[PDB]
Amino acid sequence: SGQIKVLYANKETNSTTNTIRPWLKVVNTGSSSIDLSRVTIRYWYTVDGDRAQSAISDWAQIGASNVTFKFVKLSSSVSGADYYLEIGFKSGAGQLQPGKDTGEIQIRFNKSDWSNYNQGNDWSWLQSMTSYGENVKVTAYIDGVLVWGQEPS
Ligand SMILES: [Ca+2]
Secondary structure, three states: OOOEEEEEEEOOOOOEEOEEOEEEEEEEOOOOOEEHHHEEEEEEEOOOOOOOEEEEOOOEOOOHHHEEEEEEEEEEEEOOEEEEEEEEEOHHHOEEOOOOEOOOEOOEEEEOOOOOEEHHHOOOOOOOOOOOEEOOOEEEEEOOEEEEOOOOO
């Protein structure tokens, strides 16, 4: 079936920033292996003045090229989100075995005019978790089914 945890490291402590930096990791905590292509992660936030947006992995243990990004503007705003960044994995990311993790996934994202975000009104931001921990407001899915975290209400 599939059991996972997502770990999170905030690499931008300034609330005001042109670059959100939610580093991530997927841990397979169940008993079967999981194809990482089946896994999606969502970082829910408020855009703070809508613009084109770009997300980049500068480096990932599984190979940055294997990380996919999709910005989704939410149909309706919810508490601390009008967008999410959906992080996914190509076949090249491969399989996560029981008890193992992806290792580090670096992520940054910015608006195309480098205008500032405010991270303080972001559902998924955890300012102080600057090393890898459990940020339950970054949610994760297997085949589109929520398996980790709390989506914004
Ligand atoms: Ca915001």
